[PDB]
Design a protein around this ligand. Sequence first.
Ligand SMILES: CCCCCCCCCCCCCCCCCC(=O)OC[C@H](COP(=O)([O-])OCC(O)COP(=O)([O-])OC[C@@H](COC(=O)CCCCCCCCCCCCCCCCC)OC(=O)CCCCCCCCCCCCCCCCC)OC(=O)CCCCCCCCCCCCCCCCC
Lengths: 99, 60, 61, 119
Amino acid sequence: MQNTTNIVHVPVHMGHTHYFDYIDSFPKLKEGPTLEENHITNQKILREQLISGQQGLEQNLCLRNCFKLSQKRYIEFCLDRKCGGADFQRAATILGYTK
Amino acid sequence: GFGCFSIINYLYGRYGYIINESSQKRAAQDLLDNDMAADKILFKNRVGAPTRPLRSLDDM
Amino acid sequence: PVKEGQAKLWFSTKEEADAYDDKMISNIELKSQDYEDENFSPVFNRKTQEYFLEPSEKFKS
Amino acid sequence: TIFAETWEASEYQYRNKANLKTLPVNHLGKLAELKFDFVEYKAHQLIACHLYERMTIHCMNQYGLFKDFYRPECLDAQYYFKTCVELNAAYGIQKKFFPEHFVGSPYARPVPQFQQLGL
Ligand SMILES: CCCCCCCCCCCCCCCCCC(=O)OC[C@H](COP(=O)([O-])OCC(O)COP(=O)([O-])OC[C@@H](COC(=O)CCCCCCCCCCCCCCCCC)OC(=O)CCCCCCCCCCCCCCCCC)OC(=O)CCCCCCCCCCCCCCCCC
């Protein structure tokens, strides 16, 4: 089989230029906001999180660190030992892991 | 001369609608009045293309 | 008016047949070569007979 | 059987084998090499292998089959028509009984069910 053989799952368009072979465009490629427009957007999110989203943060960080453990029995031990005796399903609802 | 020409080019950019905004609104509705007048009297084939503009003097 | 011939249509009722003729007639665009006609076309005049590719007599012989 | 005028070129390329042939569309440039006058509609030129068939009929109507049909424009039309219907018959059977050989088939490289991942 040809050594330079690839299978691509998204559409691409090749250039019809002599001596060159490349992908000149992608079909239906939409340009989002610029790097500066995204920056201003993120600054507004980070500003509100800095001003109004810092109270009660130490408790939520402990719940998040406990839920990164491998086994569930270690998560329950982490919640009981480090998070002041929190409930598994109650902390999972706070973090947003409950359906 | 370069300064005067570049200045009057700016004043006609910033200003200008003081004297030319009427002739643009006039040509704006005129551009639409003759367009609507064209659709009334013009031969359109089964696709929306005026393939007979030289049918008569009013069509041209 | 519609002329009848050996090649017939494929509709059960006459209303379906007359509806097919009305659809085909409403798409006809006359292209005449004579001046003083409402449908006049010196160039781009359409033919009114369809060509059919058939094996000729030299073909089959 | 292809039920359209156009087909994806990649759907007739092999995924697990070297690609040494393609299934190209009709060569419309050969239609302009006929010296005589003939009537051809654009509605018949895209369906596979049929343009070469109509070119052969036009050449066998203008000329015969003896000492006049033997010109480069007419012999290439007959050769292309015979070769086209042979390749399409082989690709058609391979598409019917070996669909997993081609790019785009979900069985060329099957994606496993989630029950096989052990999660
Ligand atoms: C470098 C500078 C120096 C050199 C200069 C050289 C200039 C030459 C370059 C060409 C310029 C570009 C303009 C080309 C226009 C196309 C003309 C054309 O092909 O004919 C079709 C044209 C339309 O055919 P039709 O029969 O009406 O179609 C009926 C169908 O039902 C139609 O329905 P359908 O369903 O069958 O659809 C068919 C389909 C077919 O589609 C196509 O095939 C495509 C056609 C291409 C045109 C599409 C783009 C149109 C853009 C519009 C803007 C053009 C403005 C003009 C640009 C000039 C630039 C300065 O659609 C069309 O038919 C297209 C409509 C074509 C209309 C053309 C617009 C009219 C021009 C307006 C100005 C008239 C000036 C004439 C002055 C002559 C003075 C002698 O035929 C005619 O116009 C006949 C001529 C007029 C009759 C009066 C008798 C005059 C006899 C004059 C004889 C002398 C000739 C000149 C000799 C010069 C040396 C002395």
